[PDB]
Design a protein around this ligand. Structure first.
Ligand SMILES: [Zn+2]
Length: 182
């Protein structure tokens, strides 16, 4: 309810990135708290783009590739495979405040160890410090609908519904960010 807890998509207002299918933070668990996004889903070494806060709150920097933003209500968002982090621990931000970019290379994207296909943001929803399901969560005019397995991207099950337009938006297609809803 708090406007400052209202969420937008985690890239700049006025811009469009391609989401993949919802999944858990680990990629093999439950609930489906996360989706990935990238402008073009390119190979390592390509240009990458600005990640922004989905909502207002307190920044905590967990490594050079991971950032958390926590709203006073207890809702929070996690941002992973980051680079060029331009916020500090304890810093106050609002929706659309730039946090950094998603990392363009293996070394920078996987600063904590592990695997990935190529440059993208790994974005997650939390409440009370725990990862929670994205099901029914709103980002601007979009209501997210979660699929039936990790990374499920079949548009009959996984999609964003735009309440301002009556349109359904699928994985691996540009998703426009109009910012916060009134
Ligand atoms: Zn992910």
């Amino acid at each position: 309810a708090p406007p400052s807890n209202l969420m937008q998509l985690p890239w700049r207002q006025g811009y469009s990135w391609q989401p993949n299918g919802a999944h858990s933070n680990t990629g093999s668990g439950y609930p489906y708290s996360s989706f990935d996004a990238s402008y073009d889903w390119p190979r390592w070494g390509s240009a990458t783009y600005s990640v922004v806060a989905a909502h207002a709150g307190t920044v905590r920097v967990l490594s050079r590739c991971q950032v958390r933003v926590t709203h006073p209500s207890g809702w929070a968002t996690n941002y992973y495979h980051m680079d060029q982090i331009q916020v500090s621990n304890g810093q106050q931000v609002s929706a659309d405040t730039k946090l950094g970019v998603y990392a363009g290379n293996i070394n920078t994207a996987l600063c904590e160890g592990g695997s990935s296909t190529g440059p993208h943001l790994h974005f997650s929803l939390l409440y009370n410090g725990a990862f929670v399901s994205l099901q029914g969560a709103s980002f601007g005019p979009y209501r997210i609908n979660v699929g039936t397995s990790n990374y499920d991207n079949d548009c009959r099950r996984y999609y964003f519904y735009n309440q301002s337009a009556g349109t359904t938006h699928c994985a691996f297609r540009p998703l426009y960010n109009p910012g916060l809803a009134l």
